[PDB]
Design a protein around this ligand. Sequence first.
Ligand code: ZEM
Length: 294
Amino acid sequence: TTPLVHVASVEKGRSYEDFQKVYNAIALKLREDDEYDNYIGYGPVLVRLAWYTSGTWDKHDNTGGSYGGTYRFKKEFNDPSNAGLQNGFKFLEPIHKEFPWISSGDLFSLGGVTAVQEMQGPKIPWRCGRVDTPEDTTPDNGRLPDADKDADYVRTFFQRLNMNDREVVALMGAHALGKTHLKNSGYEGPWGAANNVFTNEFYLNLLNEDWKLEKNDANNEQWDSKSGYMMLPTDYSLIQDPKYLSIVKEYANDQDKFFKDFSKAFEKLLENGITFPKDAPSPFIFKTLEEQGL
Ligand code: ZEM
């Protein structure tokens, strides 16, 4: 019906310390389950999960987003759009059991933040307060982007998430992480060499590698390099469009700028649709396990 307002409500009696403990649990499990996906680890899929769940948001009616933490995935993950995400949810289940008080939305988004930081990425301010909304679920059907599209599609798509050119290019840098799996999305191959280390490699590879457009074993077109890397048509569109290209070059030449811009864009993504009271706690900046000597 009429647009609904989602006000962040801090989990009763919880403070920064409580959430750092959750972060630590996630970070410790990331370290422990090192063999997942041929030793890439769960970091990438957790970042994907955080993006996907938040990416369901629609600025027009404030439906979807990370707030409710309640979704209905098309074909129960047996669709090229969401196949693989169940791995992230399975990873987080034990965490939710250890900390039953945290909301699902807070857990899903915190998983993404934790993964980025533990993989040596930028610190990402994170705010608690998402409230589970069972009875009000968001189906992912047709809400996330297709990979077989061009720059115009990408630009238009992200306008629904209230993201501009710089925000879009910065967010896509997350593809430095993990890889596409043929059986999941119909695409196969990593975007770079350091699959579980957050860097600006995505942009360097786009600009420096020799790419060739060809069909994969699923008959889908993707760009492949002699180094064994790949780029989705949507990734490659970032260097075909002149406006996107300039930004790709900027991030390829300034690691710090990319980190700062990604940090802002990612927090924004995870917070879309959420209203934070003026007297709400300041954003939390969690310490990595390394910083805590853990
Ligand atoms: C144009 C927009 C996008 C499209 C079309 C798109 C996309 O089609 C796909 C596809 C097909 C896969 C491969 C799935 C598979 O086979 O397992 C995949 C995997 C991952 N992504 Zn991705 N992505 C967009 C935006 C963003 C944004 C924004 C992200 C976060 C900031 C972020 C993070 C991650 C990550 C980390 C992965 C790797 C997951 C893994 O399991 O390795 N993405 N992404």
